[PDB]
Amino acid sequence: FNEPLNIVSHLNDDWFLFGDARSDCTYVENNGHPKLDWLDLDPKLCNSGRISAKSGNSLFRSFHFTDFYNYSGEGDQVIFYEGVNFSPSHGFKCLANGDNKIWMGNKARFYARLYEKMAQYRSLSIVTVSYAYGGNAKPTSICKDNKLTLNNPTFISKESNYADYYYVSEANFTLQGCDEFIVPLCVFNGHSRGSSSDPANTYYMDSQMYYNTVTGVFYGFNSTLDVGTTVQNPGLDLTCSYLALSPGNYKAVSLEFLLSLPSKAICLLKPKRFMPVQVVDSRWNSTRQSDNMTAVACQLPYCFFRNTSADYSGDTHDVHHGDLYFRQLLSGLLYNVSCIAQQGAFLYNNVSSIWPVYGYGHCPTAANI
Amino acid sequence: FNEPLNIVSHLNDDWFLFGDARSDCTYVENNGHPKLDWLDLDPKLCNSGRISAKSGNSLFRSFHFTDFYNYSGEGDQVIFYEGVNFSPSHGFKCLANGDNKIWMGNKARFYARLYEKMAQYRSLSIVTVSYAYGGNAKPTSICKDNKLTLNNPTFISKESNYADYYYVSEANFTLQGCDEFIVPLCVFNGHSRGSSSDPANTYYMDSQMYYNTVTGVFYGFNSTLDVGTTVQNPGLDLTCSYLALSPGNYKAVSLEFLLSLPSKAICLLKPKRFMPVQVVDSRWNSTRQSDNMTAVACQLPYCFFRNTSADYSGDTHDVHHGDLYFRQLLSGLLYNVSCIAQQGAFLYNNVSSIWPVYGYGHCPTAANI
Ligand SMILES: *[C@@H]1O[C@H](CO)[C@@H](O[C@@H]2O[C@H](CO)[C@@H](O)[C@H](O)[C@H]2NC(C)=O)[C@H](O)[C@H]1NC(C)=O
Ligand SMILES: *[C@@H]1O[C@H](CO)[C@@H](O[C@@H]2O[C@H](CO)[C@@H](O)[C@H](O)[C@H]2NC(C)=O)[C@H](O)[C@H]1NC(C)=O
Ligand SMILES: CO[C@]1(C(=O)O)C[C@H](NC(C)=O)[C@@H](NC(C)=O)[C@H]([C@H](O)[C@H](O)CO)O1
Ligand SMILES: CO[C@]1(C(=O)O)C[C@H](NC(C)=O)[C@@H](NC(C)=O)[C@H]([C@H](O)[C@H](O)CO)O1
Ligand SMILES: CO[C@]1(C(=O)O)C[C@H](NC(C)=O)[C@@H](NC(C)=O)[C@H]([C@H](O)[C@H](O)CO)O1
Ligand SMILES: CO[C@]1(C(=O)O)C[C@H](NC(C)=O)[C@@H](NC(C)=O)[C@H]([C@H](O)[C@H](O)CO)O1
Ligand SMILES: *[C@@H]1O[C@H](CO)[C@@H](O)[C@H](O)[C@H]1NC(C)=O
Ligand SMILES: *[C@@H]1O[C@H](CO)[C@@H](O)[C@H](O)[C@H]1NC(C)=O
Ligand SMILES: *[C@@H]1O[C@H](CO)[C@@H](O)[C@H](O)[C@H]1NC(C)=O
Ligand SMILES: *[C@@H]1O[C@H](CO)[C@@H](O)[C@H](O)[C@H]1NC(C)=O
Ligand SMILES: *[C@@H]1O[C@H](CO)[C@@H](O)[C@H](O)[C@H]1NC(C)=O
Ligand SMILES: *[C@@H]1O[C@H](CO)[C@@H](O)[C@H](O)[C@H]1NC(C)=O
Ligand SMILES: *[C@@H]1O[C@H](CO)[C@@H](O)[C@H](O)[C@H]1NC(C)=O
Ligand SMILES: *[C@@H]1O[C@H](CO)[C@@H](O)[C@H](O)[C@H]1NC(C)=O
Ligand SMILES: *[C@@H]1O[C@H](CO)[C@@H](O)[C@H](O)[C@H]1NC(C)=O
Ligand SMILES: *[C@@H]1O[C@H](CO)[C@@H](O)[C@H](O)[C@H]1NC(C)=O
Ligand SMILES: *[C@@H]1O[C@H](CO)[C@@H](O)[C@H](O)[C@H]1NC(C)=O
Ligand SMILES: *[C@@H]1O[C@H](CO)[C@@H](O)[C@H](O)[C@H]1NC(C)=O
Ligand SMILES: *[C@@H]1O[C@H](CO)[C@@H](O)[C@H](O)[C@H]1NC(C)=O
Ligand SMILES: *[C@@H]1O[C@H](CO)[C@@H](O)[C@H](O)[C@H]1NC(C)=O
Ligand code: NA
Ligand code: NA
Ligand SMILES: [Zn+2]
Ligand SMILES: [Zn+2]
Numbered sequence: 076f077n078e079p080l081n082i083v084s085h086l087n088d089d090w091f092l093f094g095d096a097r098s099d100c101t102y103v104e105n106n107g108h109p110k111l112d113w114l115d116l117d118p119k120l121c122n123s124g125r126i127s128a129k130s131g132n133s134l135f136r137s138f139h140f141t142d143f144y145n146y147s148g149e150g151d152q153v154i155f156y157e158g159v160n161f162s163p164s165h166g167f168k169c170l171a172n173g174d175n176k177i178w179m180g181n182k183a184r185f186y187a188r189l190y191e192k193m194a195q196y197r198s199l200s201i202v203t204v205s206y207a208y209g210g211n212a213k214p215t216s217i218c219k220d221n222k223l224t225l226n227n228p229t230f231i232s233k234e235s236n237y238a239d240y241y242y243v244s245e246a247n248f249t250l251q252g253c254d255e256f257i258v259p260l261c262v263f264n265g266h267s268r269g270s271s272s273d274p275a276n277t278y279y280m281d282s283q284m285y286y287n288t289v290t291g292v293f294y295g296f297n298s299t300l301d302v303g304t305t306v307q308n309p310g311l312d313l314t315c316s317y318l319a320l321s322p323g324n325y326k327a328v329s330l331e332f333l334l335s336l337p338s339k340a341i342c343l344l345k346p347k348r349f350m351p352v353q354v355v356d357s358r359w360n361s362t363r364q365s366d367n368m369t370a371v372a373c374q375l376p377y378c379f380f381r382n383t384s385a386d387y388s389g390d391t392h393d394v395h396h397g398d399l400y401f402r403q404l405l406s407g408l409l410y411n412v413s414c415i416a417q418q419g420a421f422l423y424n425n426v427s428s429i430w431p432v433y434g435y436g437h438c439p440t441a442a443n444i
Numbered sequence: 445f446n447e448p449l450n451i452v453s454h455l456n457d458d459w460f461l462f463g464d465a466r467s468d469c470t471y472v473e474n475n476g477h478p479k480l481d482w483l484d485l486d487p488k489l490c491n492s493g494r495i496s497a498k499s500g501n502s503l504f505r506s507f508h509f510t511d512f513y514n515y516s517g518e519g520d521q522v523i524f525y526e527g528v529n530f531s532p533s534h535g536f537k538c539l540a541n542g543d544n545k546i547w548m549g550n551k552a553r554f555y556a557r558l559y560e561k562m563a564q565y566r567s568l569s570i571v572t573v574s575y576a577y578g579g580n581a582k583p584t585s586i587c588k589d590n591k592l593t594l595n596n597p598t599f600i601s602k603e604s605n606y607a608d609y610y611y612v613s614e615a616n617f618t619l620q621g622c623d624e625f626i627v628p629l630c631v632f633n634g635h636s637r638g639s640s641s642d643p644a645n646t647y648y649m650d651s652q653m654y655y656n657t658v659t660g661v662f663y664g665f666n667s668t669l670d671v672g673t674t675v676q677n678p679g680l681d682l683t684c685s686y687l688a689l690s691p692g693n694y695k696a697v698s699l700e701f702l703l704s705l706p707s708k709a710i711c712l713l714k715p716k717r718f719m720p721v722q723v724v725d726s727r728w729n730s731t732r733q734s735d736n737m738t739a740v741a742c743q744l745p746y747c748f749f750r751n752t753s754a755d756y757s758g759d760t761h762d763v764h765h766g767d768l769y770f771r772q773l774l775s776g777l778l779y780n781v782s783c784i785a786q787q788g789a790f791l792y793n794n795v796s797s798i799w800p801v802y803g804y805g806h807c808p809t810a811a812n813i
Contacts, residue, residue, distance in 0.1 A: 262660075264660065284662070284664070286664075286666075288668075289668065290668065291631075291633065291665060291666040291667060291668035292664070292665060292666075292685075293653070293663075293664040293665075293666065294662075294663060294664070295653070295655075295661070295662040295663070295664060296660060296661060296662075297655075297660040297661075297662065298660060299657075299658065299659065299660035316661075348744065349744045349745045349802075375717065375718045376718045376745050424809060424811045425809050425811035425812075425813070426809070430806055430807075431807075433718075434803060434807070437799055437809075437810070437811070438799075438800075438803070438807060438809070439809050439811070440793060440794050440795070440806075440807070440808050440809045441806070442793045442794035442806070442808070443794075444794070
């Protein structure tokens, strides 16, 4: 009786879900498909006011790239069912001889910070960050490929009067109107190039730091790897850490190569008593390559991870949308449960065959009578 | 039935207590006092092998000062009953016109890091940290008063050939043999002085950073305050942050004033599934001044704080040792409890009048039947 259920759910109506096409009731198509057949989410929840979901997008994608959706929502119990729209299938690298594995590392670090913080705050949104820069140089899109253009962090070009990239540069940015801010601090970790026409032996070791002008605390990232931009010595790409910062005026200081600074932040608002987030595995049908970086990110005590036992097997829309087992996993959002724990959700508050571990809510005992 | 108990306890025999005189069975006195009358700990636990406690000491005191006890112990459920041996009663400042409130801030930040980490590791000890320094200058005891001498971090003197303190200096240190290390990164935040004979208008703005040579990550602290070393402009003292670092070779870089680096670290070993620490309020009889910095440090989800409802009222030894209510609070270490939660310990695993919140162990229900 009352065994843990492999679902995501909620203790009361104070919940919120962040998603992609599989939770996006506003997507439109014109064909002979059944209505809303791309959904894993139950159509009854489309008008709940508790969903922020966009076909083709993810939190990581909107945070870093020009393909932007303003994910926003507030709840005590926060659930995520997204991530797949930045995966190894996309194969993103900043440069021709870059490394998607670095980008998978970035994915894991971003989601780990996000989940940790969303166990402690009710409200999430994505805000623009402005800068003040004393020179005439403008932003440059150093990191992109044929389908995605990175725009966070911003990279400022070299000033015209400088002959090389061995310069110090800086700009200030303001973080205002949120309790905490997640921003990226990144570096090209390796031997960077100014231009293709430069001598083979001239390269740069990118350095970047952010400095709080009031408190005087700074966090920094220097290049240490031997990887580069050529076929002979490949592997250079953009490594990012994700910092949780208090409101204030900040100084971005670059000691070598291009200045970078945040253009977007995750805005965190309204502290709550600690409540773990729930994360649903977000993957393709195995005809495409997926990753487990959200699983790497989802750790105790701040996150509970839920997954099915099968390939993602689309019903009518295509192979990648409308899976029976993910539909059943999400069906727990249709009702309240007594307790949400590591093993799953416990429907009833009284007795179970299994002891809940890391239980939240009104949890049952597994004692006799 | 089975209401939460205001005690510290354990789920099984896999527990450990860090303490001071009130848990130290090895202290000796020669008088007409009853045997072991300074203890709050039950004498039955003196030979348990689960206690690391020293009269006159605390974790913070041994971490920072020459009055050192090698606190060491391992357990799944970790309990702390210490802290009072660095308090406002001691009135410690690095300098004549310093600020004990800065030192209380340091106390809170140290214990917050320690409690957080001891919810995630079984084993704690204090290890020495060595350095490599390319100059001839030796350590100097810049921070002390009439009863305490700070020795962590170490401060290296100016080289003889330098005329002033506007120099860059560095030294490397190795962290080896632990899974993680807590070390202090500190700065004199204000207008520092080279010497009393210097012109009134010459002062220094202390800067310090630690840099991981392999990964290239650095963490830094610059001076920003206007406080100083004189009666006219007082308040300068040593502000410290407490960093959790992985094993490796590190570089301490000082851009101004004296170079500082770790001489001691908290050695963290043996990852465990998340289990909150229990902290007992550590204060004097109110004839002396206490602080609540361990309470500020003890936050959810990593720590449960326990306190009595009375002044600390010593029985026979003196006013500061052997309190009835603290004796009863610690008596929970004599037996196992089913569940340890935010409200207190629940003895039985089946039913209670109260729903456990943030429960660990085999927790009861408050449902009917
Ligand atoms: C991080 O990288 C920067 C940029 O290369 C380093 O700054 C230079 O360091 C070298 C020697 O260490 C000096 O010769 C340069 O004059 C420094 N400044 C500039 C503006 O180039 C910086 O030292 C590195 N950080 C650490 C902690 O080693
Ligand atoms: C932290 O403080 C150090 C030491 O004062 C700063 O280093 C100096 O900065 C000024 C201008 O910002 C330069 O004129 C000096 O030449 C710098 N170097 C040295 C060795 O004095 C450092 O800039 C401060 N950090 C930040 C992020 O502002
Ligand atoms: C090419 O792949 C994507 C896209 O990159 O936008 C992925 C979307 N999937 C998710 C999970 O967000 C997919 N949406 C649906 C309803 O099929 C869309 C959609 O097929 C196209 O925008 C229109 O065909 O395409
Ligand atoms: C496309 O390849 C590269 C190159 O290897 O030359 C990548 C460089 N980026 C890094 C991180 O090493 C890029 N540098 C700048 C400052 O834009 C240069 C540059 O854009 C071009 O060579 C044009 O000068 O191009
Ligand atoms: C002066 O205060 C202290 C000390 O600074 O060491 C505090 C000790 N208290 C704690 C809680 O650790 C106290 N211990 C006992 C058993 O009385 C000792 C002790 O009185 C002296 O070492 C010997 O009298 O003195
Ligand atoms: C005792 O007072 C002070 C002072 O104000 O002169 C404190 C200084 N410390 C700070 C942090 O400002 C100290 N400086 C050094 C480098 O030792 C000097 C110095 O020891 C003496 O003046 C002897 O030169 O003394
Ligand atoms: C996103 O929505 C939030 C909530 O209204 C808002 O504060 C924020 O400025 C928006 N961001 C962008 C980039 O439109
Ligand atoms: C950035 O802030 C610093 C410190 O307050 C200031 O000195 C500097 O002038 C600012 N930068 C710009 C471009 O205004
Ligand atoms: C993610 O996948 C890798 C490679 O298969 C594996 O080593 C790792 O344990 C996985 N992590 C999680 C949390 O599932
Ligand atoms: C989820 O389950 C599928 C099928 O069992 C498996 O391929 C996938 O690796 C699992 N996800 C994670 C993050 O381990
Ligand atoms: C993908 O989805 C289809 C259709 O649901 C399913 O039959 C198949 O098992 C899945 N996997 C692969 C590799 O085709
Ligand atoms: C969930 O509980 C709330 C009260 O906390 C109630 O308003 C709501 O109707 C419940 N939801 C369902 C689907 O029964
Ligand atoms: C709960 O367990 C205790 C200890 O065995 C017992 O005294 C009590 O009767 C039990 N209560 C119920 C409702 O089973
Ligand atoms: C403290 O004890 C531990 C455990 O034996 C040991 O590893 C460490 O080196 C000791 N530290 C000092 C400073 O004696
Ligand atoms: C400290 O390490 C750095 C980087 O590996 C090295 O360049 C430097 O020589 C070392 N310092 C000393 C004093 O050996
Ligand atoms: C500590 O004491 C201060 C001053 O009385 C008070 O403002 C603060 O709330 C206290 N904090 C805790 C956690 O008890
Ligand atoms: C513990 O209780 C005493 C007496 O009620 C009180 O003075 C003290 O401030 C309490 N401790 C904290 C940390 O609040
Ligand atoms: C301190 O301890 C004594 C002796 O136990 C007790 O009577 C008194 O109430 C306590 N407080 C003060 C301020 O003396
Ligand atoms: C606590 O439980 C353990 C078994 O987990 C047992 O060995 C021990 O005797 C118990 N302690 C007491 C004081 O009963
Ligand atoms: C637990 O609660 C459910 C729902 O009311 C009920 O069906 C069941 O009989 C209860 N079990 C016990 C032992 O009270
Ligand atoms: Na840079
Ligand atoms: Na310094
Ligand atoms: Zn369709
Ligand atoms: Zn005595």
